[PDB]
Every structure is written in C-alpha cells, then in structure tokens.
Amino acid sequence: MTKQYERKAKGGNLLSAFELYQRNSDKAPGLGEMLVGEWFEMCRDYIQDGHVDESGIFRPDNAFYLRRLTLKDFRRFSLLEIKLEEDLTVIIGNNGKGKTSILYAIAKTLSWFVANILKEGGSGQRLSEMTDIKNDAEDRYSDVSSTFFFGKGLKSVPIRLSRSALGTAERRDSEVKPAKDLADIWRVINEVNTINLPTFALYNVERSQPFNRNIKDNTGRREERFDAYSQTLGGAGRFDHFVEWYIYLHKRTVSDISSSIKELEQQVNDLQRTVDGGMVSVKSLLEQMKFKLSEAIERNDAAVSSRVLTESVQKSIVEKAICSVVPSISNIWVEMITGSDLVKVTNDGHDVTIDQLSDGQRVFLSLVADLARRMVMLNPLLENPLEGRGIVLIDQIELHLHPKWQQEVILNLRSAFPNIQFIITTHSPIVLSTIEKRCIREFEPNDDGDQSFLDSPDMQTKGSENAQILEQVMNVHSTPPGIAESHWLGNFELLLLDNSGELDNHSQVLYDQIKAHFGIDSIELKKADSLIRINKMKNKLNKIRAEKGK
Amino acid sequence: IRLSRSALGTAERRDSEVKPAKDLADIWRVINEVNTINLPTFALYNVERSQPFNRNIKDNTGRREERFDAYSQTLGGAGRFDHFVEWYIYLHKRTVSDISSSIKELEQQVNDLQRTVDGGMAVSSRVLTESVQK
Amino acid sequence: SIVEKAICSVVPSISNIWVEMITGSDLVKVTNDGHDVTIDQLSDGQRVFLSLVADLARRMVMLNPLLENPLEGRGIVL
C-alpha cells in the first residue's frame, strides 16, 4: 500500500504523492519528518514546474485541459461525443441553441472544480431533471461525462454529472470524486504554500449588458485572492468587480506606497504618551491597531516577497493586457474627479469613459478585463500571470465585432493567454479564417436536434479567403441568390452562347444593363468583356480548325 | 428641429428649438381628435432588443389596448420576443370565434359555456378588429 | 370531471367550476351562491377550503390512475 504509492511517486504520480503526504502529515512533529517535506515538495513541483520555450512564453510541464465530453440523453442528444483540442476548439453550426447546451454542460462540469478549489467538500452545479433530461429518453436519466488531463502523472480525471427522473426505480448519481481529489490537491498545496491556480470562466450572450456607472462601494472582498472564482461561470463576467478592483489598485499605487509603513506605526509612538502619562487603563484606545499592524504585515509579506504581486505590477499587467487584446483601446487609467473616481480609456486616440464606449468595444473590454484580472489574481507566482492554466468558454465570439476585428480577435486572445484552453462558438467565416481545420467541429443536428459526433471540415481554413469558407464550410452563396442582378452574367453568358458567342441584342441590352448597374471598373464588366473575347476567339478557332480538318 | 444641450457648469445653456415639430404633431393630434387619420410610426430597435425582458405582463395584457399604445416604448425596448408571444397567444385566444365587442364578450360567455336553453329564461382611438389585426 | 364533482360536493357555497379562455388570460370561475365569480374574488374561508379540497383531489386523481374513483385511494392527510 505504502510501497506501491512510493513507487508510483518515484515514477511520477501526483495522486500517490498527495496520498502519502496526507497520510504522513498527521504524524507527530519530529517523527516522520523530511518525508512530509519531500512528498509536499514533489507535489508542489508537479503543480509548479515549467520552462520558457524559445518564443519567450512560459509553458507548464503538466498542462490542464479538457479532453472529452459525452452527453447521453442530455437535452436533445442521445449520445454526443466531442473531442477537444489542447489549445482551441470552435463549434460552428446553424443550430445555436444546442451549441449553447454543450457550453452549459462544460460550465457545469467546471463548477465542481471551482467549488472544491474554494472550499473542502464543496458542491458544484447539479443537472436539473426538468430541462436537462431528454423527454424522448427511455432510460429516464441523463449524464454528462468529462475527461480531464493534468500531465503524464494524472492522465485521466473522469467526472460524470448524472440526473434521473422522478419515480425511477434506480437513482443515477454523479461520480465527481476524481475532480474533487484534484481540486483537493490544488487547495491543500495552495494552503500550505502559494501555487498558481487554474482559471475557469464562461462568457455567454448575457455578456452584452449595459454598464452601470456608479458602482457599489462594497470594499473588502474585491482584493481577496479567491474572489477570482466569484460568479466566474455565471455567463457575464463581473466587470463591475473589475472596475472596483482596478480603482482599489490605483488607490493603493498612487498613495500608500510612497510612505509605505511609515505613518501606520507612528500611532503607537504617539499614543504611548497617553499610555504612560494619561490613564492607567488605555487598552480601549489601542485594542485594534496593535494586531492590525501584525496582520497587515503578514498579508503584505506576499507583496514584498516573491509572492502575490504588488498593486502597481498587477495594474500594469492588466493595462498591457487590455491594450494588447482590444485593438481600439490605447491605454487605460483611473482619474480622480471631484467627489468620484472614474475609469478612462484612450479609445481611437480620444479620452473617453467606460460608459461612452460602443457596445462592441465595451463588451470585448469587459471580457478581456475580467479574464486578465482573474489570471492576475490566480497566478501570483508567474512573471506573466496571463500564462497560467485554465479553461475559458465563449459563446458567439463574433458578437458586436466588425469583420476587421474578427480577423484578429482569436489571434489576440491566443497571444495574450497562451496556455488557456479556449472553447468558443462562432458562425462567421472571418473568424474561421484564423483557425486551423483541426480545431473546428461542425454541429449539423437532425430534425430531433440530435447529433452524434461533431465533424471537422474537409478543407483547411487557416489561410483561405472568406468567400471560400462561406461557400464551402457554411453552405452560403457568395452572391445573394435572391437578387436578379447576381444572375446577369450567367444569363448573359447563355445569351452569347445561344447565338454562338457574339453579342446580339438580347445580349447588348444585358451588357449595358450590367455596365449601368455594376460600372465600368467592376469585376462583373471585366468578366463580361473576357467572356466576349473568349467567344470571338473560340469562333475564330472553330473556323481555323475547320479549315485544317476539312 | 434642433436638439441642443450644454455641458455641465457652462454659464450659458443652449436651447433646443422644437416648435415646428410640436406644431406638426399638434396638427396630427388635433386632426385625429376630430376625424380619424393614419398616424406615422416612429420605432427604434437597438441591440438591447435581444436581451430578455419581463415585468409580470401576464394578465396585465388584459387592459383594452388603446390606439396610442403603439407609441409606448416605441423608441426604447420595442421588439421583445416575450412581449410578442404573450400578445400573440392573447390575441389568438380572443380571435377564436372572433366575437368580442364591448358587449359581445358576454355573448360568447353564454354561447360557449352555460348555453342554458333548458335551465330557464372615440374618434381618436379607432382601430381594426383583432382578427384583422392578427 | 372527477375534480369538478369533488370540489362542488365538498365546498358548500361552490356549485360549479370551469375555465374561461375568452378575455384571453386564463381564468378559473366558480358559482358562489348562484353568482358567477372569479377565483380571486372568493372570501377567506371559501378560498382556503377550496384550496385544500382542490389540492387533495388533484393529488388523489394523479396518484390513482387505475381506480374507477381516484378519491378512494389510500393515504394520510393532516
């Protein structure tokens, strides 16, 4: 039992090392020591080890991502199997209220990881028998099976979310134990010694909501580290939380750092006068600050050591992230107006507030700022906290985006967050032109909404033109089929060929119908002229070949 | 019509001249108040129409739809799917055997249910019927 | 029909109950002492007893599908 776990740990096994650490940590101090240190050290090294590749991006030795998803009797899927790429997965398809169910299932799966990271024995979201269980199902139960990967030592972390209908003879229960074990390892190792934690986020259509300007001054909870897990899978990123956190960071940077701990300890020296020559009993005047300074020091030792970053560094990192990802925002800063603290950005070279932004820029800023803040809070031991692990789900990545922005949104997201597994849905060919073929899953259901396996397109879509992806992947005509003007060159070609290939009259009315509509320099007129020249040359050919033959 | 506003704290306030629009709308309203005339529809459908809405409009739907209810929320949250489905179901329920006048809701009342037989016995708000409205 | 008969037989004042779909929100109407009135215009005492009887009759009907008279099913009511 112990020997097998020791051998597995020597060969590489996070679970065995954690089990040995847990079993020998309960021993009395001075007895099985060094053993506990070695087991905890190797667990922390498994979680923390990594190398910087040739591109300057930190890469973890053991990456965390979701490998497989199975939806059995879930919503409208009898048995749907999805394979997910380590870096990017894109679900494309017309039926978009069934791509949202896949994202919902993944979010429910990740909620267990989030809950068990936050608290021991926590409970994630549970499947609802009213909506999640398919009514066509004969087994009267549904399950959502996910398999995770956390390096060679932990290849598979299978978690199943099961629900059964009321009155069934047998109950269908979840199997969330392996995910609970992995999150227990994360939480315990972090409690003993700070480690980088994964970031699980979900961004739904409800992302597009109006800003609320004046913002609850609920100070005290936005600075705590585990607030990065607060409402992180709700669908709408907490942008108000980001604004409060950013304002708090700016307040702690512009002041409280030039003086540092200079005037706080001065109150002890000042009140020592009343302690000595005042009243014998003075504890009621100095009952809080005495241990307040000690707890402040034991909290700020992270900010002064190779630990949780300083407020200025976090603010600079989030600023650079926001500027790099959002192509219209140049820089962001906090301004103190009389009686208020506003957040201003340089949008398109002009200084505007957050609520003066357009719907697209503001929504993308909310997404990027929320993700960057969560990574900054959750990765305090990294040179670039944006290179931490995590799984981020985005619904309709192309929402409120111009095609020019769609040409680079995915590239910017992958550049700013190199190690995030992005599972997004889209229906625009411009976004697909920046995504590899292997990362695309076509969702074509049936009349029951039931698909079994999501497929990849036949042609590569990384360097292809937008029209080619539109017509070959989305089955959408490049020209509008419902317009008579789009068939003029095909009608005209038949009319040339009707009379053997010479502009007649039903072909000159058409050629100048095309010239008047499209113009002289249009592509359509060039095609018409080329077709005219080809017809004339082919007729001359036919004459020449007839001369040669006959 | 010019709509003007001045920045906060500015000594002089720019005034919006909206008198001609008021006069044209007054013409419309007065002519309608004498004899029924067709009125223009000014609707705005911003991107907020996709967001879900709700205000316990159930049964609240049952308040005789006045003609000028087409101007309520017309330049705000107009095109909401929920509002459409509740109004459509309500109208279909009233449309089945289209009868309802101010009195004729008491005629379908007795004709459909409790038929008995053996038991005993404005010009400014003119609108089309609810069956030609559906 | 079974629920209607149970409600009319147990509640003294209520004589007949039905659903009105014209005026196109769904409404439940009962005959209180010969006057057709809506379900939210009942008094406290004709509405509480009606709620008790209607709930019990509904649950008995749904839980006893094989009985000729579903109200003759067994159970414990407090």
From Swiss-Prot, chain A:
<comment type="function">
    <text>Probable ATPase component of antiviral defense system retron Ec78, composed of a non-coding RNA (ncRNA), a reverse transcriptase (RT), this protein and a putative HNH endonuclease. Expression of retron Ec78 confers protection against bacteriophage T5. At multiplicity of infection (MOI) of 0.02 cultures slow growth when infected with T5 but do not collapse, at MOI 2 cultures enter growth stasis.</text>
</comment>
<dbReference type="GO" id="GO:0016887">
    <property type="term" value="F:ATP hydrolysis activity"/>
</dbReference>
<keyword id="KW-0051">Antiviral defense</keyword>
<protein>
    <recommendedName>
        <fullName>Retron Ec78 probable ATPase</fullName>
    </recommendedName>
</protein>
<keyword id="KW-0547">Nucleotide-binding</keyword>
<dbReference type="InterPro" id="IPR027417">
    <property type="entry name" value="P-loop_NTPase"/>
</dbReference>
<dbReference type="GO" id="GO:0005524">
    <property type="term" value="F:ATP binding"/>
</dbReference>
<dbReference type="InterPro" id="IPR053498">
    <property type="entry name" value="Retron_ATPase"/>
</dbReference>
<feature type="short sequence motif" description="ATP-binding">
    <location>
        <begin position="93"/>
        <end position="100"/>
    </location>
</feature>
<dbReference type="InterPro" id="IPR003959">
    <property type="entry name" value="ATPase_AAA_core"/>
</dbReference>
<dbReference type="Pfam" id="PF13304">
    <property type="entry name" value="AAA_21"/>
</dbReference>
<keyword id="KW-0067">ATP-binding</keyword>
<dbReference type="GO" id="GO:0000731">
    <property type="term" value="P:DNA synthesis involved in DNA repair"/>
</dbReference>
<dbReference type="GO" id="GO:0051607">
    <property type="term" value="P:defense response to virus"/>
</dbReference>
<dbReference type="GO" id="GO:0006302">
    <property type="term" value="P:double-strand break repair"/>
</dbReference>
